[PDB]
């Protein structure tokens, strides 16, 4: 068992498909998620060939360990792929017809910044090293390549499974590589977001505004403070769900803009009554009556300001 | 070994049955569920036929190695089934009785719109790829599809383990594929939810209503927002049990009524303090002993309202 | 490998005996135990005869495929036991002592309506289904049967290691299935339950009731709200390491009791501010007065009635 | 491959001797920790024996399946060790070498006695069942028993690694068994503890104390109660890292000992406003000032009280 | 399958180089990150030595079972590397080039110290036991070490991966081990931590310090105390994702520091009230007036102290 020789010089063109079964634990954090598919592979070995009209069958089954068969490994996996021969077939001419159903942890780096609005793009590298005798080149058979309807990845929309049909051919280790990228496409469902944590979050800051409608320094403590003590809660419900992340996410520039919003409104508090104790409530009144309308539209500005930058 | 060739040109009919043995941990976050179960299934393989008289024996054994199997598998599990066979028995017209015990990680999608009053119904489907010689068809044996009486579910009450007699047929990539559906439907043990979540939602809920029997600022301002950052304990609880669905759920509409009641509770001690210090608690004390009657009517009727669109 | 053929038409005893060396990790929620034993089999494999004259040995060992041993299963287990073959020897007679050395994460149910003073009673089912030419029976070897003196279940304390004798044949599948069942009774340490949950949720409850003994409104709302918060986190503290039962626990009912004393207790205090607003604290020092006695014998004697119902 | 048969009547000692690589993931609730190690084998096979003048060769070399080995096992592992065998060396008088690479979870019981200022010694038991033909003892080789410079237990101090010299030979299920034990000897960092929780947890209690410097009811209930949640925040942080011990801890006994420093401090705050409104505050003034000398002496000497008890 | 023979008395020189391929779950707390790798070996085996000429081939393949491969293990892992053999080549000359992808959970200290603006040197240890007949000694082919361009550690910054061309050779349990040190370079990515932890912890520092622009008790009990509550949040918060060191971490100094800044911030609140409490608000003022320049003073000179003894 070794590689079949060529004809003429040229490179063995294997043709691959993915056919996804399963899309499962799209861990955020890790940025991993789970696969369960097929794998088709395609060659021509000529020293398997033969004539069809003598032999009275027209199709030949084969054992993985008797025939030669390419060594395609994934690139981004945790560990190897759980992989189950299907099915091994033969044609007259020497074509090969290897399935196997596989299942792998894939390492897919996700973009946070549109966070909880964000699309993806996620990845699955087929890699073949080349041979002594000869170099192994991947090709896309996209008759092949799909998923099935009933692929649901919870809390996500898929969009489209796809396969970059030029695969990248490089030098590694004195040694030719052939590398195919299938990309799955998915895009986030932000609907629960806004009951559950950006409605919430908005109470509880609208709450700490009623200090406007107030001169009672103890009652606006009370509000501004506790207020702020479930924004903490929620900041550390969402920070949770995210991994540490080198830039701003959409989510975290709000969380921080809401903590600003939270110690201005607690410098307000403050100063009407520095005021109101040094005897010129006009003075205190005044600021109060402005901040009023100065906090809701300075927010609503400078959401608008966040949403562009963003999106 | 390779499969029976077919008498006239029908397909080979496999007879399957599954025999529950555990059912447990269903993760309601990642819609799974684990299952040891019983695999049995049978077809005609003519190859293995044999005269009970010259043979001496009514029953031949076969290791699986021997004989030829059909490649049964799972659709909707994390990995390949973690089975071990406990028999293969082979009547003397040919038809082979096969037996195995597995264990498998099933991904069944939950419906969490009426959580926790829920029913679910969960699948297990079963596969068997079509190979070049001749076409594979699955067939349910009504009298091999079980569970044991002491088989529980946690926390849910199963009804019953059926399974759709017809099997799904369909081709995929140039091959047919028989598919079947085996069914476990389960309602939800909702009893625990009353005592622990439901009633002390509604008594911390009440605790913010006393602010209409009291025209003290200070202290309306302490009921209203400590029972607020109370509820905020509690719908963080019920959401983590939760996965993000893109739909509402029972729940997650009374968690979100209820963040209403609390910021409309808010605005009442803000506008009935205002007054007060306007000099005009006439106009105050009319809206308290309004709200006093309102809270508890809109809140009942809301319920009443929710409950309706849900059940 | 086939059964061994019978001498009469009687079925095969295979002489059970299960040796607990570790018991471990028992996880409540689960309700799942991971135990490491010894597992000693023992039947008549006449076939396997020898003269130690003739042979040289006294007892002649065996590797597990040389020799026919029978498929002895768990039922209550989550996947296939992880099982060491650590002796085979047969005796010039025919009879094979096995010995292997078993690990496996067993699910027996678990009565948590008398948590944390409650016991509980482990199971362990040996199966072994019988084979078409002969019938297999299972039988307990009492000789066989223990436990080591270190043997530590943390947090419980380990009563008894027991199996019944006789056991449970039926039929499953057209085939008899011969079942034992291996009891561990345990007892729960509830020594660390009073000083980390019980006492510190009975002082925060006190705590509260300080409000009794003052008339001001607002340190009475800080008083019974602030308490109320510190047990709601005692609660979801307890109900997290408790699974969600369809029945109540002794905890459960203990807990949601407390919730009503809180609820009471902002009744009492909006009652006696009512009434000193109204102008007659003259009424409102009365029931305060009343509290004082009140609260701390209904408590005493809702208490009695739970241990009463419980125990 | 059958145990080598005695010269004159004695049992087959196997010369033993484990040397730590890693030390990792001490796991102080399930009382476990994980361990990579080598482990060294050494007894006299008299038909291994060969002249070293005429084979030329001093050494000889084996694979494992060629010649027997003693099943050597871990009495107090979660799993079968995973082990790799470096190397077997058969010297010319029969007198073979084994060594393995093998990692293993060890379940070793701990003493939270005196946490987190307590020491453990952990427990590596090696035991061999003695077979038919002849009893096998378990020996240490003093020279082959040791850990590297680098191996860290994170949080730990490891002191020794030594191992009893004398076996513990024992009956079970009616054959020999010969258990060695290996002792790891560890101490506790107890350093990070002081500024993350026992400092923290003291500011928060001597902040409750300001309450005696005060005779604002209101700011006082505050005070004591704000500080008691703060309070069950470091309790539950602690506790979580600790598992349900049956005893009390050096650490449990201060939690609730602080516990009730926060309820005589309620009680304090609530005479002290009692005898206040009561028109009589040269009663009161007394109380509180006295409360100011009582509190910091009586915890004082209720902490050297429990010191002396628990070390 | 034995060593080759030495031509004169040399030890083995064998050539290793490890590539890179995933790099990821960098565990904080348990100290230990996944890694995904090429390991390529090449040795001077001269019994598989053949002439070009009568061969009419340049290179000879080899399966593993059939020739003698070294055997390499990594020293600083929790268990076997999972391991796939890529290629086997064999030269005219008998020098073997090997390749295997393999994956292993790698266990390397971290130093915390300047956490999280620390910088960390991750280690993957060669080791090769020397066997009887010859010694086994490692090199480094810098041509065969690297890592791809793709390779990303989330949240942290990949420097360089080198090896100490130089091996560690020793002797243990009587045998020589050569060691090789393959070093992982590191940088944390700090952005996050100031968004999300840092500034928040300040503004709510702040925020307490509002406390010296009033002369209200009861308001400023609830902001020193409230404002506490927040940071005893945030050290939770930080605390859990580091493991228990025996030294101080920049972060743990400056945590610590803050929670001093609470305690003298609650001191002064208590001072300023006592002294106005005791007819002298002359007093009070002066240390209140002088608080709000002294409090951000130290505050900013004793984070430059810190930022000094820890950069
Ligand atoms: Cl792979
Ligand atoms: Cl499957
Ligand atoms: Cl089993
Ligand atoms: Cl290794
Ligand atoms: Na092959
Ligand atoms: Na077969
Ligand atoms: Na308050
Ligand atoms: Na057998
Ligand atoms: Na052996
Ligand atoms: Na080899």
Redesign the interface.
Known sequence: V?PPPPIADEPLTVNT?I?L??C??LDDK??TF?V?A?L?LSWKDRRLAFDPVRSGV??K?YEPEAIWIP?I?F??????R?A?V??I?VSPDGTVQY?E?F?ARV?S?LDFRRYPFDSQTLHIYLIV?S??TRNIVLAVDLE?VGKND?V?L??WDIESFTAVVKPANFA??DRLESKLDYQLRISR?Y???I??II??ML??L??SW?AF???????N???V??????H??????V?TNL??????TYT?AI??MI??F??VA??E??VQ??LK?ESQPARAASITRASRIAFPVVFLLANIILAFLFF
């Open positions: 070794s498909g056919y079964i399963e499962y634990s890790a940025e789970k369960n097929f088709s027209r199709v089954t060594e490994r690139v981004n996996v945790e560990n190897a759980d189950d299907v099915d077939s399935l159903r299942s390492l780096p090293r041979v002594d092949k009933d649901f919870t809390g590694l280790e469902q609907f629960s977001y009951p559950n409605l919430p109470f509880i609208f709450i009623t409608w107030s001169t009672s320094y103890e009652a403590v009370t509000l403070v506790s207020t702020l003590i479930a903490i809660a929620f900041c550390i419900l920070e991994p540490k992340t080198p830039y701003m975290g969380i921080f903590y600003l939270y110690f607690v410098i508090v403050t009554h520095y104790v």
